[PDB]
């Protein structure tokens, strides 16, 4: 996935934010096919927006949105220690 889709996810997200079942389409798609590099998260800000459904009322949301946030966290530690 590259930056231009992921922006247009990210706007996706903001307004679809009330529709439970078409924000977890948008998080599904983010975290099978969007890749996490320091340029895509520092470009597009894909890890402040997801980041934001921490707090959902949606238990599945809020779930997925944490193991996705871990694996971004975990995968820019690594770009940064050993890639960059």
Known sequence: MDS?????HVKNLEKNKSNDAAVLE???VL???????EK??????VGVEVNKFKKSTNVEISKLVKKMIS??????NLENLYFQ
């Open 4 to 8: 231009k889709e992921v922006l247009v």
């Open 31 to 37: 975290d099978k096919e969007f890749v996490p590099t």
């Open 71 to 76: 694996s971004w966290k975990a995968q820019l």
């Open 26 to 28: 948008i998080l599904h």
């Open 40 to 45: 895509l998260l520092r470009e597009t800000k």
